[PDB]
């Protein structure tokens, strides 16, 4: 029975599985009223990828496809319809048991980045772009999305197109940023399918523990963050190892290697998320050279040492 | 001795260690005249990072720092000076034995990306939240103003005014601005990390085949362009996931050369073999330039430690 393990990469050596950002802090928010059901950064402890999760850090919130039509929006500038493929270039088959192409964004918001094209030496262009994932035109499970640009004309149709994500366009009221609200992958009247399950503590006094990254903004006021359940390197490790889960809950300890001291402990649940016994919201203050070490398999009734 | 291993990753599951791009193809170019001495994606088989190599995919060709002021520069655009720190925010100490802050670009060219800022000061009427901005930007790494080992670089924008002095600044790389002759793209020419006319130091060593008939094998990614004609590529010696794997394993190297086989998981067959050298690079027996045409579900499997006398089966 291949023993279970976590990477020994430290906090300052990890990246977010839901947006291409470094991990900045560990974070809790016990009074969260939203159902937590993100679709990127989802992997079971025995290495099963779920939701829209894929392995490439470059694939998170990325799209590939081709533009088909230009449409001026009445309020939000120039829009472009885009057919999307899988990130490996193959056609996306909507009958596969996934919510949307792997890497599709998993939250409501205006995602800011750059659209680039290299024609089928070829000509090239790139421009800043925004994808409103709450729009009725955001239908990646149906093979098509829309993006908008400040550029009014220089986007070509029928040519290979890449979206490289960079941050958010805004977090104003009118920009519908909510990291826990899933897009409607097939449009508003259609149910999402093949989702990774929601996650929650099941024991009193526990809360979820997140790996938090602060996300850039194109403009406006705000200090937005994206919280993932496990960093991308954990997804990659678990997929590689595929170690059998010996119970439903692993016990992990956050350790300071220099002193060898454990700073706190957490439950790492089979479905791929952490809980801690903490009754406060906000960052965990601890060294970014610290790291989680697997201790032993426990169960849902194990009582964590309070933080 | 802890056994040496590689990750199990098809080519379609790997990313470049020299720019944030997926690996697209394996590639050779035996008649390359340049010295190959890249500084990102450098790690020995026993897990020693070298050059400017760091572990985060988000840190490759990234900078963090603060804009100081707008500057005049004969070249087109609006120019800005920025101090740079280490990527983790701590001050860069030029006395450390590295060529430049980890993650600094390792090639000559006009690197295109986005500069973003989140102000330090907050506004009460905005919920005690800071103002933000982002704009497209270009960093010419051949410029005399590209001096990351001195803690300072310059970037240019199309935007003419909306970049703030004294505020935290991030550069997110996206591609190249141009590959015209006037944009000095050369993936094997290192920047002058301390400026015009200074010698770079603390470099990861150059790599080469030493056995007749062998050439370097690269993990190639095609890099986006802001404009112009071209199909530029960036070639790395090992993908970022191998750097990450070797760093964590730190398995002792039992000879100077690990024999690896590129295997198709579905067929089970070996497509070709290669030497994986101690300093962290591959050679193959091949006498042509261009892509290696093989499925992207293929992967390298470690077979055994051999020595430099070993003769590879021709590809
Ligand atoms: C707070 C500011 O954000 C951006 O300014 C934006 C303006 O350019 C304009 O588009 C309005 C439209 O509603 O939105 C603003 O947010 C930054 O460009 C500026 O520097 C401020 O940080």
Coordinates of C-alpha atoms and ligand atoms in Angstrom, one line a residue:
Chain A
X1 CA 0.0 0.0 0.0
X2 CA 1.8 3.1 -1.3
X3 CA 2.1 5.5 1.6
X4 CA 0.3 8.8 1.3
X5 CA 2.4 12.0 1.0
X6 CA 2.3 15.7 0.4
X7 CA 5.0 17.7 -1.5
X8 CA 7.5 19.4 0.8
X9 CA 7.3 22.6 -1.2
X10 CA 6.8 25.5 1.2
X11 CA 4.0 28.3 1.2
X12 CA 6.2 30.7 -0.8
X13 CA 6.8 27.7 -3.2
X14 CA 3.1 27.1 -4.0
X15 CA 0.7 28.4 -6.6
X16 CA -3.1 28.8 -6.7
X17 CA -5.1 26.1 -8.5
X18 CA -7.9 28.4 -9.4
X19 CA -6.0 31.4 -11.0
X20 CA -2.3 31.7 -12.0
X21 CA -1.1 33.4 -8.9
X22 CA 1.4 32.5 -6.1
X23 CA -0.1 31.5 -2.7
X24 CA 0.1 34.5 -0.4
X25 CA -1.4 33.3 2.9
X26 CA -3.5 30.6 4.5
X27 CA -7.0 31.9 5.3
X28 CA -10.2 31.1 7.1
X29 CA -13.7 32.5 6.9
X30 CA -16.0 30.5 9.3
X31 CA -19.1 32.6 8.8
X32 CA -19.2 32.1 5.0
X33 CA -22.7 31.7 3.9
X34 CA -22.0 30.5 0.4
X35 CA -21.8 26.9 -0.7
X36 CA -18.1 26.2 -1.6
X37 CA -18.1 24.2 -4.8
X38 CA -15.2 25.4 -6.9
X39 CA -14.3 23.3 -10.0
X40 CA -10.5 24.0 -10.5
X41 CA -8.1 22.7 -8.0
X42 CA -10.2 19.6 -7.3
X43 CA -8.5 16.3 -6.8
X44 CA -9.2 13.4 -4.4
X45 CA -6.4 12.3 -2.2
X46 CA -6.0 9.2 -4.3
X47 CA -5.3 11.2 -7.4
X48 CA -8.7 11.5 -9.2
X49 CA -9.0 14.9 -10.9
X50 CA -12.5 16.4 -10.7
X51 CA -14.6 19.3 -12.0
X52 CA -12.7 21.2 -14.7
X53 CA -9.3 20.5 -13.1
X54 CA -6.3 19.9 -15.3
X55 CA -2.6 19.7 -14.5
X56 CA -1.0 22.7 -16.3
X57 CA -0.4 25.9 -14.3
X58 CA -0.7 27.6 -17.8
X59 CA -4.2 26.0 -18.3
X60 CA -6.0 27.5 -15.3
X61 CA -8.5 30.1 -16.6
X62 CA -7.1 29.7 -20.1
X63 CA -9.0 29.3 -23.4
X64 CA -8.0 28.2 -26.9
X65 CA -10.2 28.5 -30.0
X66 CA -11.0 30.8 -32.9
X67 CA -13.0 34.0 -33.3
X68 CA -16.1 34.0 -35.4
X69 CA -17.9 37.4 -35.2
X70 CA -17.5 40.9 -34.0
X71 CA -20.4 42.6 -32.2
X72 CA -20.4 46.0 -30.7
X73 CA -22.0 45.9 -27.3
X74 CA -24.4 48.7 -26.4
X75 CA -22.7 49.3 -23.0
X76 CA -19.4 47.4 -22.8
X77 CA -17.5 48.1 -26.0
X78 CA -16.4 45.7 -28.7
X79 CA -17.3 42.0 -28.3
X80 CA -16.0 38.9 -30.1
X81 CA -17.6 35.5 -30.3
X82 CA -15.1 32.7 -29.9
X83 CA -15.5 28.9 -30.4
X84 CA -13.4 27.1 -27.9
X85 CA -11.6 23.8 -28.2
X86 CA -9.9 21.7 -25.5
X87 CA -6.6 23.4 -24.4
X88 CA -4.7 20.6 -26.3
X89 CA -6.4 21.8 -29.5
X90 CA -8.7 18.8 -30.0
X91 CA -12.4 19.6 -30.4
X92 CA -14.3 19.8 -27.2
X93 CA -16.9 17.0 -27.0
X94 CA -19.8 18.1 -24.9
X95 CA -20.8 14.5 -24.2
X96 CA -17.7 13.9 -22.1
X97 CA -18.5 13.8 -18.3
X98 CA -17.0 17.2 -17.4
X99 CA -18.7 20.5 -16.6
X100 CA -16.9 22.4 -19.4
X101 CA -13.5 22.3 -21.1
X102 CA -10.8 21.6 -18.5
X103 CA -9.3 24.9 -17.2
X104 CA -12.5 26.9 -17.8
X105 CA -12.9 29.6 -15.0
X106 CA -15.0 28.4 -12.0
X107 CA -16.3 31.7 -10.7
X108 CA -18.5 34.7 -11.6
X109 CA -16.6 37.8 -12.6
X110 CA -15.0 39.9 -15.3
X111 CA -11.7 38.0 -16.0
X112 CA -9.1 40.3 -17.5
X113 CA -6.2 39.0 -19.6
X114 CA -4.8 39.1 -23.1
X115 CA -6.1 37.5 -26.3
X116 CA -3.3 36.6 -28.7
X117 CA -3.4 35.2 -32.2
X118 CA -1.0 33.6 -34.6
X119 CA -2.4 33.1 -38.1
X120 CA -2.6 29.8 -39.9
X121 CA 6.0 33.7 -41.3
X122 CA 2.5 34.1 -39.9
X123 CA 1.0 37.4 -38.8
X124 CA 0.2 38.0 -35.1
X125 CA -1.7 40.3 -32.8
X126 CA -2.6 40.6 -29.2
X127 CA -4.9 42.8 -27.1
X128 CA -6.2 43.2 -23.6
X129 CA -9.5 41.4 -23.2
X130 CA -12.2 40.7 -20.6
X131 CA -14.4 37.6 -20.3
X132 CA -17.6 38.1 -18.3
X133 CA -18.3 34.6 -17.0
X134 CA -21.8 35.5 -15.7
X135 CA -22.9 36.6 -19.2
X136 CA -25.5 34.6 -21.1
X137 CA -22.9 34.4 -23.9
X138 CA -20.5 32.5 -21.6
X139 CA -21.4 29.0 -22.7
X140 CA -18.1 27.0 -22.8
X141 CA -19.9 23.7 -22.3
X142 CA -21.6 24.5 -25.6
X143 CA -18.3 25.2 -27.2
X144 CA -18.5 29.1 -27.4
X145 CA -17.8 32.2 -25.3
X146 CA -17.5 35.9 -25.8
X147 CA -14.7 38.3 -24.9
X148 CA -14.6 42.1 -25.0
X149 CA -11.8 44.3 -26.0
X150 CA -10.9 48.0 -25.8
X151 CA -9.4 47.5 -29.2
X152 CA -12.2 48.2 -31.8
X153 CA -11.0 46.3 -34.9
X154 CA -7.8 44.4 -34.9
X155 CA -9.0 40.9 -33.9
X156 CA -9.1 38.4 -36.7
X157 CA -11.7 35.7 -37.4
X158 CA -10.9 32.1 -38.2
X159 CA -7.4 32.2 -36.7
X160 CA -5.9 30.4 -33.7
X161 CA -6.6 32.4 -30.5
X162 CA -5.3 32.1 -26.9
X163 CA -6.6 33.8 -23.8
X164 CA -3.9 34.3 -21.2
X165 CA -5.5 35.3 -17.8
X166 CA -4.0 38.1 -15.8
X167 CA -6.6 39.3 -13.2
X168 CA -10.0 40.9 -12.9
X169 CA -11.3 43.9 -14.8
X170 CA -13.3 45.2 -11.8
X171 CA -14.9 44.2 -8.5
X172 CA -17.5 47.0 -8.6
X173 CA -21.1 46.1 -8.0
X174 CA -21.9 46.0 -11.7
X175 CA -19.1 43.5 -12.3
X176 CA -20.6 40.5 -10.4
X177 CA -17.4 39.2 -8.8
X178 CA -18.3 36.3 -6.5
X179 CA -15.6 33.6 -6.2
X180 CA -18.1 31.0 -4.9
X181 CA -20.8 31.5 -7.6
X182 CA -20.2 29.1 -10.5
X183 CA -20.7 30.2 -14.1
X184 CA -23.7 28.6 -15.9
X185 CA -21.4 26.6 -18.3
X186 CA -24.3 26.0 -20.8
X187 CA -26.1 29.3 -20.1
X188 CA -28.6 30.5 -17.5
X189 CA -31.6 28.3 -18.0
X190 CA -29.5 25.1 -18.0
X191 CA -28.1 23.1 -15.0
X192 CA -24.4 22.6 -14.6
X193 CA -23.3 18.9 -14.8
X194 CA -20.5 16.6 -13.7
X195 CA -19.5 18.9 -10.9
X196 CA -17.0 18.3 -8.2
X197 CA -19.0 18.1 -5.0
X198 CA -19.4 20.9 -2.5
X199 CA -17.1 20.9 0.5
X200 CA -17.8 21.8 4.2
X201 CA -16.8 21.0 7.7
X202 CA -18.9 18.3 9.3
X203 CA -17.7 18.8 12.9
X204 CA -18.6 21.7 15.2
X205 CA -16.0 24.4 15.6
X206 CA -14.2 23.4 12.3
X207 CA -14.0 25.6 9.3
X208 CA -12.5 25.3 5.8
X209 CA -8.8 26.3 5.5
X210 CA -7.9 28.0 2.1
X211 CA -4.8 28.8 0.2
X212 CA -5.4 32.5 -0.7
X213 CA -3.9 34.6 -3.5
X214 CA -4.6 38.2 -4.2
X215 CA -5.6 38.8 -7.8
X216 CA -4.7 41.9 -9.9
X217 CA -7.2 44.5 -11.0
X218 CA -7.3 46.4 -14.3
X219 CA -9.0 49.3 -12.5
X220 CA -11.1 50.5 -9.6
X221 CA -10.9 50.0 -5.9
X222 CA -10.5 46.6 -4.2
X223 CA -8.2 44.0 -2.8
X224 CA -9.7 40.9 -4.3
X225 CA -8.6 37.4 -3.5
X226 CA -9.1 33.9 -4.9
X227 CA -9.1 31.0 -2.4
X228 CA -8.3 27.5 -3.5
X229 CA -8.8 24.2 -1.6
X230 CA -5.3 22.8 -2.4
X231 CA -2.5 24.4 -4.4
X232 CA -1.8 23.3 -7.9
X233 CA 1.4 21.5 -6.9
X234 CA -0.8 19.3 -4.5
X235 CA -3.0 18.5 -7.4
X236 CA 0.0 17.5 -9.5
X237 CA 1.5 15.5 -6.6
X238 CA -1.7 13.5 -5.8
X239 CA -2.2 12.8 -9.5
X240 CA 1.3 11.4 -9.8
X241 CA 1.3 9.4 -6.6
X242 CA -2.3 8.0 -6.6
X243 CA -1.8 6.6 -3.1
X244 CA -4.7 4.7 -1.7
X245 CA -6.7 6.6 0.9
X246 CA -6.8 4.5 4.1
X247 CA -9.6 6.5 5.7
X248 CA -11.8 9.5 4.8
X249 CA -9.6 12.0 6.7
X250 CA -5.9 12.5 6.9
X251 CA -4.3 14.4 9.8
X252 CA -1.6 16.9 8.6
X253 CA 0.6 19.2 10.7
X254 CA 1.9 22.5 9.7
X255 CA 5.5 22.5 10.7
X256 CA 8.4 24.9 11.1
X257 CA 11.3 22.8 9.9
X258 CA 13.9 24.9 11.7
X259 CA 12.5 24.4 15.1
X260 CA 10.8 21.1 14.0
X261 CA 7.8 22.5 15.9
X262 CA 4.2 22.0 14.8
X263 CA 2.3 25.3 14.5
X264 CA -1.1 23.7 14.1
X265 CA -2.8 20.7 12.7
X266 CA -5.6 20.2 10.1
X267 CA -7.8 17.5 8.6
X268 CA -7.1 16.8 4.9
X269 CA -10.3 15.2 3.7
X270 CA -10.5 12.5 1.0
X271 CA -12.3 14.7 -1.5
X272 CA -9.3 17.1 -1.4
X273 CA -9.8 20.0 1.1
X274 CA -8.7 21.1 4.6
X275 CA -10.5 21.9 7.8
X276 CA -9.1 23.4 11.0
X277 CA -10.6 24.1 14.5
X278 CA -10.5 27.9 14.3
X279 CA -13.2 30.3 15.3
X280 CA -11.9 33.4 13.6
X281 CA -11.7 34.8 10.0
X282 CA -8.6 36.1 8.3
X283 CA -5.1 35.1 7.5
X284 CA -3.1 32.5 9.4
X285 CA 0.0 34.2 10.6
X286 CA 2.9 31.8 10.1
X287 CA 6.2 31.7 8.2
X288 CA 6.0 31.2 4.5
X289 CA 8.8 28.6 4.8
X290 CA 6.4 26.4 6.7
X291 CA 4.8 23.4 5.3
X292 CA 2.2 20.6 5.8
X293 CA 3.4 17.2 6.6
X294 CA 1.1 14.1 6.6
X295 CA 0.9 12.5 10.1
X296 CA -1.6 9.7 10.0
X297 CA -5.1 8.6 8.8
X298 CA -7.9 9.6 11.3
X299 CA -11.7 9.9 11.0
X300 CA -14.6 12.3 10.9
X301 CA -14.8 12.1 14.7
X302 CA -11.1 13.1 15.4
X303 CA -10.9 16.3 17.4
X304 CA -8.4 18.8 16.1
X305 CA -6.2 20.8 18.4
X306 CA -7.7 24.3 18.5
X307 CA -5.8 27.1 16.6
Chain B
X1 CA 20.7 6.0 -1.8
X2 CA 17.2 7.3 -2.5
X3 CA 16.4 6.0 -6.1
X4 CA 16.3 8.7 -8.8
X5 CA 13.0 9.2 -10.6
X6 CA 11.3 11.5 -13.0
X7 CA 7.6 12.6 -12.9
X8 CA 5.3 10.6 -15.1
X9 CA 4.0 13.4 -17.5
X10 CA 3.2 13.3 -21.0
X11 CA 4.4 16.1 -23.0
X12 CA 0.9 17.6 -22.9
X13 CA 1.1 17.8 -19.1
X14 CA 4.4 19.8 -18.9
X15 CA 5.2 23.5 -18.9
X16 CA 8.3 25.5 -20.0
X17 CA 10.8 26.5 -17.3
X18 CA 11.9 29.7 -19.2
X19 CA 8.5 31.3 -20.0
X20 CA 4.9 30.5 -18.7
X21 CA 3.9 28.3 -21.7
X22 CA 2.9 24.7 -22.1
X23 CA 5.5 22.4 -23.8
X24 CA 4.4 22.0 -27.4
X25 CA 7.1 19.7 -29.0
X26 CA 10.5 18.2 -28.4
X27 CA 13.1 19.8 -30.6
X28 CA 16.7 19.6 -31.8
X29 CA 19.0 22.0 -33.6
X30 CA 22.5 20.4 -33.9
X31 CA 24.1 23.2 -35.9
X32 CA 23.3 25.9 -33.4
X33 CA 26.3 28.2 -33.2
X34 CA 25.4 29.9 -29.9
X35 CA 26.6 28.9 -26.5
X36 CA 23.5 27.4 -24.7
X37 CA 23.7 28.9 -21.2
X38 CA 20.1 29.6 -20.1
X39 CA 19.6 30.6 -16.5
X40 CA 15.9 29.6 -15.9
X41 CA 15.1 25.9 -15.8
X42 CA 18.5 25.0 -14.4
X43 CA 18.6 22.2 -11.8
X44 CA 21.0 19.4 -11.2
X45 CA 19.7 15.8 -11.1
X46 CA 20.3 15.8 -7.3
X47 CA 18.1 18.9 -6.9
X48 CA 20.4 21.9 -6.8
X49 CA 18.8 24.9 -8.4
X50 CA 21.1 27.0 -10.4
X51 CA 21.2 30.4 -12.3
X52 CA 18.0 32.4 -11.7
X53 CA 15.9 29.3 -11.3
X54 CA 13.0 29.3 -8.9
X55 CA 10.1 26.9 -8.3
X56 CA 7.0 28.9 -9.1
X57 CA 5.5 28.7 -12.6
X58 CA 4.1 32.2 -11.9
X59 CA 7.7 33.5 -11.1
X60 CA 9.2 32.8 -14.5
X61 CA 9.9 36.1 -16.3
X62 CA 8.0 37.9 -13.5
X63 CA 9.0 41.0 -11.6
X64 CA 7.8 42.6 -8.4
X65 CA 8.7 46.0 -7.1
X66 CA 7.6 49.7 -7.3
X67 CA 7.5 52.2 -10.0
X68 CA 9.7 55.2 -9.1
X69 CA 9.0 57.7 -11.9
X70 CA 8.3 58.2 -15.6
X71 CA 11.6 58.5 -17.6
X72 CA 12.6 59.8 -20.9
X73 CA 14.0 57.3 -23.4
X74 CA 14.7 58.0 -27.0
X75 CA 12.7 55.0 -28.0
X76 CA 8.9 55.1 -28.8
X77 CA 6.4 54.8 -25.9
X78 CA 6.1 56.0 -22.4
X79 CA 8.8 54.7 -20.1
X80 CA 8.9 54.0 -16.4
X81 CA 11.6 53.0 -14.0
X82 CA 10.8 50.4 -11.4
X83 CA 12.8 49.0 -8.5
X84 CA 12.6 45.3 -8.2
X85 CA 12.6 43.1 -5.1
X86 CA 12.8 39.4 -4.7
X87 CA 9.5 37.8 -5.9
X88 CA 8.7 37.1 -2.2
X89 CA 8.8 40.8 -1.5
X90 CA 12.0 40.9 0.5
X91 CA 14.7 43.3 -0.7
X92 CA 17.1 41.8 -3.3
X93 CA 20.5 41.6 -1.9
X94 CA 23.1 42.0 -4.7
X95 CA 25.7 40.3 -2.6
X96 CA 24.0 36.9 -2.8
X97 CA 25.6 34.5 -5.3
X98 CA 22.9 34.6 -8.0
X99 CA 23.0 36.4 -11.4
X100 CA 19.9 38.5 -10.7
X101 CA 16.7 38.1 -8.7
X102 CA 15.3 34.6 -9.2
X103 CA 12.8 34.5 -12.1
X104 CA 14.5 37.3 -14.1
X105 CA 14.3 36.7 -17.8
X106 CA 17.3 34.9 -19.3
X107 CA 17.2 36.0 -22.9
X108 CA 17.5 39.1 -25.1
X109 CA 14.2 40.4 -26.4
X110 CA 11.2 42.7 -26.0
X111 CA 9.1 40.8 -23.4
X112 CA 5.4 41.8 -23.5
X113 CA 3.1 41.5 -20.6
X114 CA 0.9 43.4 -18.2
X115 CA 2.0 45.8 -15.4
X116 CA -0.5 46.0 -12.6
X117 CA -0.5 48.0 -9.4
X118 CA -2.4 47.9 -6.1
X119 CA -1.8 51.0 -4.0
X120 CA -0.5 50.8 -0.5
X121 CA -2.7 53.6 0.8
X122 CA -6.5 52.9 1.1
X123 CA -9.6 55.1 1.0
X124 CA -12.0 55.2 3.9
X125 CA -15.0 56.1 1.6
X126 CA -14.0 53.0 -0.5
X127 CA -14.3 50.7 2.4
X128 CA -10.6 51.2 3.3
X129 CA -9.7 49.6 -0.1
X130 CA -6.9 50.6 -2.4
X131 CA -7.0 51.9 -6.0
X132 CA -5.7 49.8 -8.8
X133 CA -4.6 49.9 -12.4
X134 CA -3.0 47.7 -15.1
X135 CA -1.7 48.3 -18.6
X136 CA 0.2 46.4 -21.3
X137 CA 3.9 46.9 -21.0
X138 CA 7.2 45.8 -22.7
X139 CA 10.6 45.1 -21.0
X140 CA 13.5 45.2 -23.4
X141 CA 16.0 43.0 -21.7
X142 CA 18.9 44.2 -24.0
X143 CA 18.4 47.8 -22.8
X144 CA 21.1 49.5 -20.8
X145 CA 18.3 50.3 -18.4
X146 CA 17.6 46.6 -17.7
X147 CA 19.7 46.2 -14.5
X148 CA 17.8 43.7 -12.4
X149 CA 21.0 42.7 -10.5
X150 CA 21.2 46.3 -9.4
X151 CA 17.6 46.2 -8.3
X152 CA 16.1 48.4 -11.1
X153 CA 14.6 47.9 -14.5
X154 CA 12.5 50.0 -17.0
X155 CA 9.4 49.1 -18.9
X156 CA 7.4 50.9 -21.6
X157 CA 3.7 51.3 -22.0
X158 CA 1.3 52.5 -24.7
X159 CA -0.6 54.1 -21.9
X160 CA 0.8 57.6 -21.6
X161 CA 0.0 58.6 -18.0
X162 CA -1.9 56.0 -15.8
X163 CA 1.0 54.4 -14.0
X164 CA 1.5 55.6 -10.4
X165 CA 4.8 56.4 -8.7
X166 CA 5.7 54.7 -5.4
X167 CA 3.1 51.9 -5.6
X168 CA 3.5 48.1 -5.5
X169 CA 3.9 46.8 -9.1
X170 CA 3.7 43.4 -10.7
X171 CA 4.8 42.3 -14.1
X172 CA 2.9 39.4 -15.6
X173 CA 4.6 38.1 -18.7
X174 CA 2.5 37.2 -21.7
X175 CA 4.8 36.9 -24.8
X176 CA 7.1 39.0 -27.0
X177 CA 6.4 42.4 -28.4
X178 CA 8.1 41.7 -31.7
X179 CA 10.7 39.5 -33.3
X180 CA 11.8 42.0 -36.0
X181 CA 15.6 42.4 -36.3
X182 CA 15.2 45.7 -34.5
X183 CA 13.8 43.9 -31.4
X184 CA 16.9 41.8 -30.7
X185 CA 15.2 38.6 -29.9
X186 CA 17.8 35.9 -29.3
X187 CA 16.9 33.2 -26.9
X188 CA 20.5 32.2 -26.2
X189 CA 21.9 35.7 -25.6
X190 CA 21.8 36.5 -21.9
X191 CA 20.8 40.0 -20.7
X192 CA 23.6 42.0 -19.0
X193 CA 22.1 41.8 -15.6
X194 CA 24.0 44.8 -14.2
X195 CA 24.0 46.8 -17.4
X196 CA 25.9 47.8 -20.4
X197 CA 29.4 46.8 -20.3
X198 CA 29.4 44.6 -17.1
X199 CA 30.1 41.0 -16.8
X200 CA 27.4 38.6 -15.6
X201 CA 28.3 36.4 -12.6
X202 CA 27.1 33.4 -10.7
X203 CA 25.9 31.8 -13.9
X204 CA 24.7 28.2 -14.4
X205 CA 27.2 26.6 -16.7
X206 CA 26.9 26.2 -20.4
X207 CA 25.6 22.8 -21.8
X208 CA 26.7 20.8 -24.8
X209 CA 26.9 17.4 -26.2
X210 CA 30.4 15.9 -25.9
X211 CA 29.9 12.6 -27.7
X212 CA 30.1 12.6 -31.5
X213 CA 26.7 12.2 -33.2
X214 CA 24.8 13.7 -30.2
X215 CA 22.9 16.9 -30.0
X216 CA 20.9 18.7 -27.2
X217 CA 17.3 17.9 -27.0
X218 CA 14.9 20.7 -25.9
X219 CA 11.4 21.1 -24.6
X220 CA 10.0 23.8 -27.0
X221 CA 7.1 26.2 -26.6
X222 CA 5.8 28.7 -29.1
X223 CA 5.6 32.2 -27.6
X224 CA 2.8 34.7 -28.3
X225 CA 3.5 37.9 -30.2
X226 CA 1.8 41.4 -29.7
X227 CA 2.3 42.1 -33.4
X228 CA 4.4 41.5 -36.5
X229 CA 5.3 38.3 -38.4
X230 CA 6.9 35.3 -36.8
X231 CA 6.5 32.0 -35.1
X232 CA 9.0 32.4 -32.2
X233 CA 9.8 29.7 -29.7
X234 CA 11.5 29.3 -26.4
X235 CA 13.5 26.1 -25.8
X236 CA 14.1 24.8 -22.2
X237 CA 16.5 22.1 -21.0
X238 CA 13.9 20.5 -18.7
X239 CA 10.3 21.4 -18.0
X240 CA 9.3 23.3 -14.8
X241 CA 7.8 20.1 -13.4
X242 CA 11.1 18.3 -13.6
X243 CA 12.8 21.2 -11.8
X244 CA 10.1 20.9 -9.1
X245 CA 10.4 17.1 -8.9
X246 CA 14.3 17.1 -8.7
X247 CA 14.2 19.8 -6.1
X248 CA 12.0 17.8 -3.8
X249 CA 13.5 14.4 -4.3
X250 CA 17.1 15.4 -4.1
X251 CA 18.1 11.9 -5.0
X252 CA 21.9 11.3 -5.1
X253 CA 23.3 11.1 -8.7
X254 CA 25.0 7.7 -9.1
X255 CA 26.9 8.6 -12.2
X256 CA 27.2 11.5 -14.6
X257 CA 24.5 10.3 -17.0
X258 CA 21.0 8.8 -16.5
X259 CA 19.7 6.7 -19.4
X260 CA 16.0 7.6 -20.1
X261 CA 13.6 6.1 -22.6
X262 CA 10.7 8.0 -24.2
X263 CA 7.8 5.6 -24.0
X264 CA 4.3 5.6 -25.4
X265 CA 2.1 4.6 -22.5
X266 CA -0.6 3.1 -24.8
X267 CA 1.7 1.0 -27.0
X268 CA 4.3 0.4 -24.3
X269 CA 7.1 0.8 -26.8
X270 CA 10.2 2.9 -26.5
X271 CA 10.2 5.6 -29.2
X272 CA 13.8 6.6 -28.6
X273 CA 16.4 6.9 -25.8
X274 CA 18.3 9.9 -24.4
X275 CA 21.0 10.8 -22.0
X276 CA 19.9 12.9 -19.1
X277 CA 23.1 14.6 -17.8
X278 CA 23.9 15.4 -14.2
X279 CA 23.8 19.1 -14.7
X280 CA 20.2 18.8 -15.9
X281 CA 19.9 18.5 -19.7
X282 CA 19.3 15.9 -22.4
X283 CA 21.2 14.7 -25.4
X284 CA 20.1 12.4 -28.2
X285 CA 21.7 10.7 -31.2
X286 CA 20.1 12.7 -34.0
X287 CA 21.5 14.5 -37.1
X288 CA 18.7 16.8 -38.0
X289 CA 17.0 20.0 -36.7
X290 CA 13.3 20.3 -36.1
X291 CA 10.5 18.8 -34.0
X292 CA 10.4 15.3 -32.8
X293 CA 7.2 13.9 -34.2
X294 CA 5.6 11.7 -31.7
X295 CA 2.5 11.6 -29.5
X296 CA 2.2 14.1 -26.7
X297 CA 1.1 11.4 -24.3
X298 CA 4.7 10.2 -24.5
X299 CA 6.9 10.4 -21.5
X300 CA 10.5 9.9 -20.3
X301 CA 11.1 6.9 -18.0
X302 CA 14.4 6.5 -16.1
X303 CA 16.1 3.3 -17.0
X304 CA 19.5 3.2 -15.3
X305 CA 22.7 5.1 -14.5
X306 CA 25.2 4.8 -17.3
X307 CA 28.3 6.8 -18.1
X308 CA 29.5 9.2 -20.8
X309 CA 30.9 6.3 -22.9
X310 CA 27.4 4.9 -23.5
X311 CA 26.3 4.9 -27.1
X312 CA 22.7 6.0 -27.7
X313 CA 20.6 4.2 -30.3
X314 CA 20.0 6.7 -33.2
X315 CA 16.6 8.3 -33.1
Ligands
LIG1 C1 -9.6 53.9 -9.3 C2 -9.0 54.1 -10.7 O1 -9.1 52.9 -11.4 C3 -8.9 53.1 -12.8 O2 -9.6 54.2 -13.3 C4 -10.8 53.8 -14.1 C5 -11.0 54.8 -15.2 O3 -10.0 54.7 -16.2 C6 -12.4 54.7 -15.8 O4 -12.3 53.6 -16.8 C7 -13.5 54.4 -14.8 C8 -14.8 54.1 -15.6 O5 -15.8 53.8 -14.6 O6 -13.1 53.3 -14.0 C9 -12.0 53.6 -13.2 O7 -11.8 52.6 -12.3 C10 -7.4 53.4 -12.9 O8 -7.1 53.5 -14.3 C11 -7.0 54.6 -12.1 O9 -5.6 54.9 -12.1 C12 -7.5 54.5 -10.7 O10 -6.7 53.5 -10.0

